[PDB]
PDB file of C-alpha atoms in Angstrom:
ATOM      1  CA  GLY C   9     114.474 178.722 -19.212  1.00 55.90           C
ATOM      2  CA  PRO C  10     117.799 180.632 -19.449  1.00 53.46           C
ATOM      3  CA  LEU C  11     118.171 180.259 -15.681  1.00 51.05           C
ATOM      4  CA  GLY C  12     120.203 177.274 -14.515  1.00 50.79           C
ATOM      5  CA  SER C  13     121.896 176.329 -17.779  1.00 49.87           C
ATOM      6  CA  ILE C  14     125.266 176.314 -19.543  1.00 51.07           C
ATOM      7  CA  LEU C  15     126.050 177.127 -23.177  1.00 47.87           C
ATOM      8  CA  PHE C  16     127.880 174.103 -24.588  1.00 51.66           C
ATOM      9  CA  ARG C  17     129.675 174.323 -27.935  1.00 51.32           C
ATOM     10  CA  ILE C  18     130.557 171.206 -29.933  1.00 52.34           C
ATOM     11  CA  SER C  19     132.747 171.653 -33.011  1.00 50.41           C
ATOM     12  CA  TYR C  20     131.683 168.392 -34.658  1.00 50.07           C
ATOM     13  CA  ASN C  21     134.314 167.640 -37.303  1.00 48.28           C
ATOM     14  CA  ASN C  22     133.868 165.373 -40.326  1.00 47.15           C
ATOM     15  CA  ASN C  23     137.335 163.886 -40.805  1.00 48.92           C
ATOM     16  CA  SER C  24     139.595 166.751 -39.717  1.00 47.99           C
ATOM     17  CA  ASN C  25     141.337 167.927 -42.890  1.00 47.83           C
ATOM     18  CA  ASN C  26     141.991 170.936 -45.126  1.00 48.22           C
ATOM     19  CA  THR C  27     138.242 170.976 -45.779  1.00 49.78           C
ATOM     20  CA  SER C  28     135.326 169.534 -43.806  1.00 47.79           C
ATOM     21  CA  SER C  29     133.294 172.530 -42.616  1.00 49.91           C
ATOM     22  CA  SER C  30     133.090 172.085 -38.845  1.00 50.02           C
ATOM     23  CA  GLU C  31     129.720 172.607 -37.161  1.00 50.50           C
ATOM     24  CA  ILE C  32     129.378 173.982 -33.633  1.00 53.63           C
ATOM     25  CA  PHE C  33     126.097 173.204 -31.877  1.00 51.35           C
ATOM     26  CA  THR C  34     124.793 175.173 -28.897  1.00 50.45           C
ATOM     27  CA  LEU C  35     122.723 173.360 -26.268  1.00 50.45           C
ATOM     28  CA  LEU C  36     121.737 174.478 -22.767  1.00 55.62           C
ATOM     29  CA  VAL C  37     123.271 171.935 -20.393  1.00 58.11           C
ATOM     30  CA  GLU C  38     121.363 171.819 -17.103  1.00 58.47           C
ATOM     31  CA  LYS C  39     123.112 171.679 -13.729  1.00 60.83           C
ATOM     32  CA  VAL C  40     120.980 168.710 -12.679  1.00 60.15           C
ATOM     33  CA  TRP C  41     122.601 166.531 -15.340  1.00 61.02           C
ATOM     34  CA  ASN C  42     125.485 164.057 -15.210  1.00 62.22           C
ATOM     35  CA  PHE C  43     128.441 162.883 -17.295  1.00 59.17           C
ATOM     36  CA  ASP C  44     126.309 160.267 -19.052  1.00 61.36           C
ATOM     37  CA  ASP C  45     123.358 162.618 -19.529  1.00 60.31           C
ATOM     38  CA  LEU C  46     125.795 165.144 -20.993  1.00 59.70           C
ATOM     39  CA  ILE C  47     127.378 162.878 -23.607  1.00 60.69           C
ATOM     40  CA  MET C  48     123.870 161.674 -24.447  1.00 61.91           C
ATOM     41  CA  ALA C  49     122.597 165.159 -25.285  1.00 60.20           C
ATOM     42  CA  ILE C  50     125.536 165.702 -27.638  1.00 62.53           C
ATOM     43  CA  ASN C  51     124.813 162.468 -29.506  1.00 60.86           C
ATOM     44  CA  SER C  52     121.240 163.516 -30.280  1.00 61.87           C
ATOM     45  CA  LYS C  53     122.621 166.859 -31.459  1.00 62.55           C
ATOM     46  CA  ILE C  54     124.619 165.093 -34.172  1.00 61.01           C
ATOM     47  CA  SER C  55     121.563 163.143 -35.326  1.00 61.25           C
ATOM     48  CA  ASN C  56     119.390 166.250 -35.034  1.00 58.63           C
ATOM     49  CA  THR C  57     121.058 167.873 -38.046  1.00 60.88           C
ATOM     50  CA  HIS C  58     122.822 164.988 -39.789  1.00 59.57           C
ATOM     51  CA  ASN C  59     120.370 162.471 -41.249  1.00 55.92           C
ATOM     52  CA  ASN C  60     123.113 159.835 -41.177  1.00 55.45           C
ATOM     53  CA  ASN C  61     124.282 157.956 -38.082  1.00 55.71           C
ATOM     54  CA  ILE C  62     127.975 158.270 -37.219  1.00 55.55           C
ATOM     55  CA  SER C  63     129.849 156.366 -34.513  1.00 53.61           C
ATOM     56  CA  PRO C  64     128.625 157.031 -30.929  1.00 53.75           C
ATOM     57  CA  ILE C  65     130.880 159.636 -29.319  1.00 55.91           C
ATOM     58  CA  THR C  66     132.082 159.027 -25.762  1.00 57.12           C
ATOM     59  CA  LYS C  67     135.100 161.328 -25.479  1.00 55.07           C
ATOM     60  CA  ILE C  68     135.107 165.132 -25.511  1.00 59.64           C
ATOM     61  CA  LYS C  69     137.553 167.828 -24.399  1.00 59.56           C
ATOM     62  CA  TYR C  70     136.420 170.994 -22.614  1.00 58.07           C
ATOM     63  CA  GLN C  71     138.202 174.341 -22.316  1.00 57.73           C
ATOM     64  CA  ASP C  72     139.824 175.100 -18.957  1.00 58.13           C
ATOM     65  CA  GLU C  73     140.938 178.402 -17.417  1.00 57.75           C
ATOM     66  CA  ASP C  74     144.168 178.387 -19.434  1.00 56.64           C
ATOM     67  CA  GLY C  75     142.403 177.779 -22.735  1.00 56.09           C
ATOM     68  CA  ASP C  76     143.718 174.281 -23.413  1.00 52.97           C
ATOM     69  CA  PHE C  77     141.493 171.299 -24.205  1.00 53.13           C
ATOM     70  CA  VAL C  78     141.408 168.913 -21.241  1.00 54.17           C
ATOM     71  CA  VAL C  79     140.104 165.344 -21.466  1.00 56.93           C
ATOM     72  CA  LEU C  80     136.705 164.613 -19.920  1.00 54.57           C
ATOM     73  CA  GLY C  81     135.703 160.978 -19.517  1.00 54.69           C
ATOM     74  CA  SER C  82     134.981 160.710 -15.800  1.00 54.90           C
ATOM     75  CA  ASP C  83     132.105 161.730 -13.529  1.00 56.69           C
ATOM     76  CA  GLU C  84     134.328 163.750 -11.201  1.00 60.36           C
ATOM     77  CA  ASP C  85     135.662 165.579 -14.259  1.00 63.17           C
ATOM     78  CA  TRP C  86     132.163 166.932 -14.881  1.00 63.79           C
ATOM     79  CA  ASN C  87     131.711 168.049 -11.273  1.00 65.23           C
ATOM     80  CA  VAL C  88     134.908 170.102 -11.390  1.00 59.85           C
ATOM     81  CA  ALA C  89     133.866 171.558 -14.746  1.00 63.26           C
ATOM     82  CA  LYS C  90     130.855 173.165 -13.068  1.00 66.25           C
ATOM     83  CA  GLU C  91     132.983 174.502 -10.214  1.00 67.39           C
ATOM     84  CA  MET C  92     135.289 175.943 -12.872  1.00 66.66           C
ATOM     85  CA  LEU C  93     132.703 178.170 -14.549  1.00 65.83           C
ATOM     86  CA  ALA C  94     131.230 178.859 -11.112  1.00 70.75           C
ATOM     87  CA  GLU C  95     134.275 180.644  -9.695  1.00 71.35           C
ATOM     88  CA  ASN C  96     135.194 182.079 -13.094  1.00 72.36           C
ATOM     89  CA  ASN C  97     131.633 183.407 -13.327  1.00 71.07           C
ATOM     90  CA  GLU C  98     131.625 181.884 -16.814  1.00 67.27           C
ATOM     91  CA  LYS C  99     128.529 180.736 -18.701  1.00 66.51           C
ATOM     92  CA  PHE C 100     129.727 179.028 -21.885  1.00 64.89           C
ATOM     93  CA  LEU C 101     132.301 176.361 -22.752  1.00 66.87           C
ATOM     94  CA  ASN C 102     134.248 175.214 -25.812  1.00 71.06           C
ATOM     95  CA  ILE C 103     134.284 171.476 -26.514  1.00 70.32           C
ATOM     96  CA  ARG C 104     136.122 169.534 -29.215  1.00 69.67           C
ATOM     97  CA  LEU C 105     134.988 166.335 -30.935  1.00 70.11           C
ATOM     98  CA  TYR C 106     137.323 163.382 -31.484  1.00 69.87           C
TER      99      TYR C 106
END
């Protein structure tokens, strides 16, 4: 249930312009997941709403303690991400699509 999960936000952009209407999905990312299992959940989220099939995403940036978007393409990067919200007592996270 709500226990043992993290609110992940993905501002899926169309083409990034003056008009595209960005969509932010909210999925509960478990703590027993991995970097691959994470990027996989996001992919299904894009196909869950959009009937079409865009290019498979494999690069996303998460929000750190400063508020800047840091690259996340490694396994260790995911481990630290959990330790980040752990000490910060956080619960959610802002991610950007590229």
